Amino acid sequence: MARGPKKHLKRLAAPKAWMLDKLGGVFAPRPSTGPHKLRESLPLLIFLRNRLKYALNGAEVTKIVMQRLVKVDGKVRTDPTYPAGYMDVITLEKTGEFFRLVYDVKGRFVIHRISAEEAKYKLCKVKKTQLGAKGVPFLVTHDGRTIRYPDPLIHANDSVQVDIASGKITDYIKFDSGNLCMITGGRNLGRVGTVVNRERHPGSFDIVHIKDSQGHVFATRLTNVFIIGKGNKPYISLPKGKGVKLSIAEERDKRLAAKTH
Amino acid sequence: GISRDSAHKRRATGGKRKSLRKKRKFELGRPAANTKLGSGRVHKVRTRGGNTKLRALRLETGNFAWASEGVARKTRIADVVYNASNNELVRTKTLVKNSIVVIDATPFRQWYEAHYVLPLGRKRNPKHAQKEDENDVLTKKRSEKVMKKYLERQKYGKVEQALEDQFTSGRILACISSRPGQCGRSDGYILEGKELEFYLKKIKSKK
Amino acid sequence: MADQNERAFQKQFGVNLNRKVKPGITKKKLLRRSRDVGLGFKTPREAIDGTYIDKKCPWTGDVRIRGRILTGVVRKAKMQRTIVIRRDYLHFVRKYSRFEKRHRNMSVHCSPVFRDVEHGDIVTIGECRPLSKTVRFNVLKVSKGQGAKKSFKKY
RNA sequence: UAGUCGAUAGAAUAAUGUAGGUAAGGGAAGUCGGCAAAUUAGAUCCGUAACUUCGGGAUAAGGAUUGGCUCUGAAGAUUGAGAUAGUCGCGAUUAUCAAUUAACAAUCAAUUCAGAACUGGCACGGACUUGGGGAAUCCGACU
RNA sequence: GCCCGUCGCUACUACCGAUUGAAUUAUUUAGUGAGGUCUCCGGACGUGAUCACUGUGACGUGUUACGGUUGUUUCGCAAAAGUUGACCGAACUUGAUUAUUUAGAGGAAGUAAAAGUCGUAACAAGGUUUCCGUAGGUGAACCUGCGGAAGGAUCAUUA
RNA sequence: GUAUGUAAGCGUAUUACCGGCCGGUACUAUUACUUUGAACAAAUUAGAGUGCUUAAAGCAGGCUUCAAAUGCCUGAAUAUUCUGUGCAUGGGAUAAUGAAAUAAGACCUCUGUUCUGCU
RNA sequence: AUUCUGGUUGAUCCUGCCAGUAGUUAUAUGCUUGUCUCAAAGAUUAAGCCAUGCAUGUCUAAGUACACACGAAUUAAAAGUGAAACCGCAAAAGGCUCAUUAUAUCAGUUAUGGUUCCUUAGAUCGUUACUUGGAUAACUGUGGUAAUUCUAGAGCUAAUACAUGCAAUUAAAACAUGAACCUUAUGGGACGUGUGCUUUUAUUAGGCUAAAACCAAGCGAUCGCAAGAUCGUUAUAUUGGUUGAACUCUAGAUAACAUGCAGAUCGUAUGGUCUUGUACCGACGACAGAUCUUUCAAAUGUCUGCCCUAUCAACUUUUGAUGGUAGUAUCUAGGACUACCAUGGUUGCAACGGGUAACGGGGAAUCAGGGUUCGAUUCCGGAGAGGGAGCCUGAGAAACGGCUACCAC
C-alpha cells in the first residue's frame, strides 16, 4: 500500500553483478518493473552501452532502442530501461549477433553469442501451476509469461522450452535429481551440474545438493536451482569454462601460463 | 483520524509509548457505515488499491439460506431481534454480522409446499383452498409426475419442530454473516439445529 | 468448560450440518474434520472430539500457525485459552567474554484442546497469525504437560 | 388528633425604622477591622498537600453527579418436587431413597444497594437541612 | 625543628534560606473547544417523461408528436449556500505532577593564605603515650568522663 | 621387527525391510555448548587481478599489432566485519534433566474383553 | 613495537596520579603555505527565523485543434506540425535533517492461511442508433477586488471527459429445476426460462485398503407355460489444494445476489472481393479494460541484541491494563476500537520512572591481542518538515516546494 515504488536507484545501491563503475555518476539505470526482478535483471541500458560498446551514453541507448533494433524475446522493446534478465534472447537484427543472457561463474551476466536457430526458443523455469484462469489450467514462468493449458505432468521447478514466436510449450524436463542445472543466485551463481539429491524440509528452504563435473559438491536452496538439461547434454549453449568454478589462484596459474607474448 | 496501528495505548509493561509517526494514512481506518433497516441505498468507497468496497446504508433485502435444504431465497429483512455485541444495535435495527434477523418467510414456504406437499406448519381449510397459488401447487396432479416425485421424498420430510412453529408464524430466526458495511449486502444463515437451541433460551430469558 | 455459551451462537464458518436432503448416515454425529499438524507434529485427539468453537485454534479455526518454531517453559497458566512462557538462554556477548543469561517473556495462545497445561511445562510453540496483542503465538505441541511420574497413576 | 385564633382594631400602608430580601458593571476600592451580608453546605464518587506527637491535617485543596418515568440485576425466608411399588374407588390409604442444590424449582416476605434507557428549557441536595477556602504569624497544649 | 585551628583581611565556590520566589518543559483530571470527515437534512437550479394554450403535420373539434427565453398538474435522477447527530480533536483555561534552570536578606561551611593575631594541640612519654566511638564543657586548640584498640612508650623479663 | 593413529570384527539401541555394501524408508533422551553447511548488502575492512605515468587508489586496460583488424581478451575475485540470533547438520565429552522403590513401572502377548471407528 | 620517561626524599623502595610522550576523517584555532590530486563542509548550539531567485513539470505518427502560429490551393478540405486548455501521468519523493525517540526505530533473522498493489512483462471477455446525445474549458467578448490569484456573467465547440447502449450484441450446446412423450422407475426427455467473467452470501464434491451372506426398486443370466422366485463376474460411492487444514487458495456446481466488465478510441498503413450499399472483413501497438500471474513495492508479525540510573522497587488496570466472546473499523491479523465476561499482564535475569551532546544498523577511531570510544553526516531502513490536528486526490501522501483549522512566527 504505502509509499513508493520510488523510481530513483543510486549507483552503489545498484547490484554489483552489473559492474557499474562508481565514479562519474551517483545514479544507476534502475530497470523498470518488467518480468525480471530488479536485482536479477540486466537493463538494456548497461548491456548495449557498457558491454557491447554500441552506445556511449544513456542518450545513445534510448536512440538505438527506440529504433526498435533490440528485439528481446519476440518483442520490439522500445524501453531502454527494460529489465531483460535470464535466458532472454537479445537480437540486434542489423548486424545479426544473436545473444542469450546467461551467467558467468563469477555470478555476472555474459555476452554469449548463440546460433540464430538457438535464438528461436529459450528455457523457462516454471514458478507455479494453478488451476482456474482460462481455459482452465495455466502455468506461469520465472519470466512472468503465463502459458495457458499446460501439459498436466508439469510440476513446479520444471523447465519448459518456449517457442517464443508463439508462446507455446514445446518440451518439458521434470525436476528429477540427475538433471543438468545452472544456479541462479545464491553465491554459487552460474555454477553448473548435476543435482545429486534434494533434502526436503517442510516449511521451508528445501536444499539441493549439486555435484559439478569436477566432482566438487556444493549446496543452494531450491528457489535458486534452474533446470537446464540432461546430464552431459545442456539444451542451451553454456558460456566458457562451463561454470566449473576453480579457485582464483588456479585460474591465475592458467592465465599467467597462457601467454608467450 | 481513525488509526489501526498497534503502537497506540499502553504496553504490557505499562510503558509509555512516546510518538514516532503523526498519524499515517498507511494506518487508515474510517467511520462505520452503521447500516440501517430500510430503502436500498449503496455507495461506493475508494479503497486501497483502487477497488470499490461498498458501504450500504439502508438495505431491505437479503439472501437467507436453508443450509439443510441447500436452497436460499431472496426475502425481506423485517426486523433485527438480537445482537450479541450491543443492545443499542437491536433497537436502532442496524444490520450487522451476527445480528439476529427475523425474515418474512413467505417465498420459502411456497416452494417447500412445492417440494413436499406437507403444509409446513399444518395450515387450515380455507387457507389451503385459497390459491395465490397455494392449493394449485398442492393438488397439481398431471396423472402421474410431480406427484411421483413427492412419493420419493419423505423419509426426510417431517421438518424440525422448532422450524415449523417459525414457518407459519411467518417470522424466521437467522444470523447475518455478511458485513453490509464493506460487502454492501445483508445476508444470513437461517438458524437450524444447534443454532436455534442456544438462541431460543436467550429469547425467553431476555424478554 | 462452558457449553460454548457466549452472547453469540458459536459457529465455525462453512459447516452447517445438513439434516434434510443429501445421502443419509454413518454415525459420529459430527461433520468435524480434523488436522494433521505435520512437521511430523501429531494431533491431540480432542481436536476431532472438540465441541469447543475456538476460532483462534488451528484445530477448529481458519488460522495458519505461521513461521518460527520455538520451545519454551510455561511460567503462568492463568489465562482462559492462553498461557505465558519464559524462555531463558545464553546470549554470548563477546565484549564481556562471557554471556548474559537473558529472558524474553512472551504470551502464547493455548487452544482448549490442550489440557493439563500448567507451569512448568515445556511446550512447542509456533508463531501464529498474531492473535491479540501480546499473544503472537499458538501452541503446536505440549511436549511436557507433564509428570514423568504422573503419566501412570500413583497408588 | 388535641388545643388555639386573645396578644385593642380599622383605614391609610409616608418618611425614618425594625424584621426579611434583591440588585447591573466593577468586586472590599469600604472600615478600626470583611463587621454585617453573601459565597459554601447534604449525599455518592474521584482526588487530596504543607506539617505531624503518625493518631491526624481531612469534609484538606481540586473535581464530577443528584429529578421524574421506565426497565434490569443483586441482596433474604420456607417447604415442595422427582422416580417406583402395593391396596380401595384422577381421588383416598400405606411403603422407599440419596442425589436434586445457588435463587433446583415453587412460593411468601420486605425493602436495600448498583446499572441502562427515555424524558424536560439546566429543570434536578430544586422547599427545608446545611463547613467559604488556602498561605503565614502571635498565644494558651487540648475538651 | 615540624606545625594546626580559632580570630581578622581579601578573593572564589557550593549549601541552607523568608519569598510557600520566579521561568520553561513533558505527562494529567475536569471544563471549554476551532476544523475536517462521516452522517440526518436543504433545495439556490435543471431537465426528463406526461398534460394544456398557441402555431404546424399526422390520425379518428378531440388525440398524439414537434417547436414556442411558454405555463401548469402528476413523479423522478443529479444538485450549492446552509444544516442534524456522531466520532476524531488541534487549541485554550484551571488544579495536580515531573524534569530542568535560575533570583535571594541573611545564616552556615570550605578553600586559595602565601608577610598577621592568639595559644602548643599532635609529631621525642610533645613534658598529660597515642588514637577510636560517644556526650558535655573550654576562646580555640582541646580537656574531661565512660567503654575500647595499639597504628605504644610493653613484641618480654617478673618460681 | 614394530607403531595402530587410520580400516573391519565380537558383548540388552545399526534393528528391520524394498531395489541392484551402496541408497532411501521405518528410526529414536531434552538442553546449554560445540561442528559443518546454507543464509551472511555494497561501500568500508583485509586483499586478488591490473603501471590510476608515482601515490592516495582508480577499476582501469594490456595484447599480435601505434600494420591490416573486434581480431585474441583477463577483468571490477576471495574472506571477515551484517556480532550474537535463527535455519539445517554432526558429536555425545563437559554441566544439568529423564522413567520405576506407596511400581496402575517397561516391553510383548491373551482375552473379541472394552470403547472409538471404515472404503 | 605487549614499549615508558620526569615529579613525594638528605639519600632509598613501593602505593599513586599528574605531566611529558604517540595516533585520531576528529573538530577548533594560530602562524607559515609555491605545486599536484582528492573532498568533508551550518551536524554539535538554533529540528531557529527568513527578503530575492531557482529545485516539479509534462505531447508524441499515436486521446482532443476551427492557434490563421506556420503550412494552405485545387478535388470536399479539414487533415500536417503543435503553444493553450480539457484529458491522462508525475509531484507519495529526490533532496534535507536526525528533533521526538532506549526494544521504539533497526540490523541480522524471518512471515503473510493476515493482506494491498498503478505500473511493466505475459495471457483472458461470441449469453435494437453502430458510431449516437448535449454541456463546457481552451476560445470569443464583457467584468469584478488594491492585489497574488480567485473567478462572476454572456455566447461557442471537442473527447481515450461525460451520457447511453446496436447489425457480427449470437445463439447454440449441455446441466438444473417446468414438461409433450413411455414404463413401473439400470430409468430419459423434445422446448422452454435460468445458466458469460465478475460482485456478494449459503451449501456441497475435496485429501478415501480389501471381500461376502441377505432384503427393496432388476442390469444381464437362470428356474417356472405363466403367475412368480432366484442368484451374480466387472467399471464405480471419483473437485483438487498450499499443506498446521472443513482456506472462501487458482476454480466450480446447486439456491439466491448486485453491477463493474465486454472500446460509439486513436495513430500507422491499406488489401480482398463487387450485387461497389461507399457493403462485408483485416494486421501492428498507444491508451482503456476485466480475471490471473509477475514485477516495483508495502504494512504489519517472529527471533535476538542497545548508554546511564535503585539518592527510581514495585508496576499496568481514571477511560484496555492483560485475557475470552461477539461486533465494528480497515488493505490486513489484531484491545486498533466497543459491548459483555474473566482477573489478568510486567518485575532484582532491574520492571515502572527519570536522564542521555540517545535515531538504529552497515560502519569509523585507537590499538599486541582483548577491548574502549564513536556514529550528526557520503549507504540502507525509519522518522519529521515551526508545534500539533484533521482531510482530498490518487495504485499509493493523514503531504507542506497539497489543502483546511488552531496555537506560535
Swiss-Prot record, chain A:
Q: List the disulfide bonds.
A: none
Q: Which GO terms describe its molecular function?
A: RNA binding; rRNA binding; structural constituent of ribosome
Please provide the Gene Ontology terms (biological process) for this protein. cytoplasmic translation; translation
Q: Which domain of life is it from?
A: Eukaryota
Record keywords: Ribosomal protein included?
yes
Which GO terms of the cellular component aspect does the record hold?
cytosolic ribosome; cytosolic small ribosomal subunit
Q: Gene3D superfamilies of this UniProt entry?
A: 2.30.30.30, 2.40.50.740, RNA-binding S4 domain
* Residue ranges annotated for the S4 RNA-binding domain, each copy included: 42-104
Q: Which family does it belong to?
A: Belongs to the eukaryotic ribosomal protein eS4 family.
Q: Which PANTHER family match?
A: 30S/40S RIBOSOMAL PROTEIN S4, SMALL RIBOSOMAL SUBUNIT PROTEIN ES4
According to UniProt, the name of this protein is: Small ribosomal subunit protein eS4
Curated annotation (Swiss-Prot), chain B:
Show the GO cellular component annotation of the record: cytosolic ribosome; cytosolic small ribosomal subunit; membrane; nucleolus; small-subunit processome
Please cite one Gene Ontology biological process associated with this protein.
ribosomal small subunit biogenesis
Bias-annotated ranges (Basic residues):
7-22
Recorded GO MF terms: structural constituent of ribosome
Q: Which InterPro entries match?
A: Ribosomal_eS8, Ribosomal_eS8_CS, Ribosomal_protein_eS8_euk, Ribosomal_Se8/biogenesis_NSA2
**Pfam family for this entry, one:** Ribosomal_S8e
The record, for PROSITE patterns, names: RIBOSOMAL_S8E (PS01193)
Renumbered residue ranges of the record's region Disordered: 1-22
Keywords, in A-Z order: Cytoplasm, Lipoprotein, Membrane, Nucleus, Ribonucleoprotein, Ribosomal protein
Q: Where in the cell is it found?
A: Cytoplasm; Membrane; Nucleus, Nucleolus
Q: Which residues form a coiled coil?
A: none
Bilayer topology reads: Lipid-anchor
| Main function | Component of the small ribosomal subunit. The ribosome is a large ribonucleoprotein complex responsible for the synthesis of proteins in the cell. Part of the small subunit (SSU) processome, first precursor of the small eukaryotic ribosomal subunit. During the assembly of the SSU processome in the nucleolus, many ribosome biogenesis factors, an RNA chaperone and ribosomal proteins associate with the nascent pre-rRNA and work in concert to generate RNA folding, modifications, rearrangements and cleavage as well as targeted degradation of pre-ribosomal RNA by the RNA exosome.
Matching PANTHER family:
40S RIBOSOMAL PROTEIN S8
| Family designation | Belongs to the eukaryotic ribosomal protein eS8 family.
Q: How does it assemble?
A: Component of the small ribosomal subunit. Identified in a IGF2BP1-dependent mRNP granule complex containing untranslated mRNAs. Part of the small subunit (SSU) processome, composed of more than 70 proteins and the RNA chaperone small nucleolar RNA (snoRNA) U3.
Q: What is this protein called?
A: Small ribosomal subunit protein eS8
- Please report the organism this UniProt entry assigns to the protein: Drosophila melanogaster
Q: What is the lineage of its organism?
A: Eukaryota, Metazoa, Ecdysozoa, Arthropoda, Hexapoda
Curated annotation (Swiss-Prot), chain C:
Its gene name is RpS11
Under the heading InterPro entries, the entry gives: NA-bd_OB-fold, Ribosomal_uS17, Ribosomal_uS17_arc/euk, Ribosomal_uS17_CS, Ribosomal_uS17_N
GO biological process, any: cytoplasmic translation
PANTHER family on file: 40S RIBOSOMAL PROTEIN S11 FAMILY MEMBER (PTHR10744), 40S RIBOSOMAL PROTEIN S11-RELATED (PTHR10744:SF9)
Q: Which organism is it from?
A: Drosophila melanogaster
Enumerate the NCBIfam families for this protein: uS17_arch (TIGR03630)
Q: Which UniProt keywords apply?
A: Acetylation, Ribonucleoprotein, Ribosomal protein, RNA-binding, rRNA-binding
The name this protein carries in UniProt is: Small ribosomal subunit protein uS17
| Example of a GO cellular component annotation carried by this entry | cytosolic small ribosomal subunit
Q: Which GO molecular function terms does the record list?
A: rRNA binding; structural constituent of ribosome
Would you identify the family this protein belongs to, as annotated?
Belongs to the universal ribosomal protein uS17 family.
Cross-referenced Pfam families, in alphabetical order? Answer: Ribosomal_S17, Ribosomal_S17_N
The PTM N-acetylalanine maps to 2
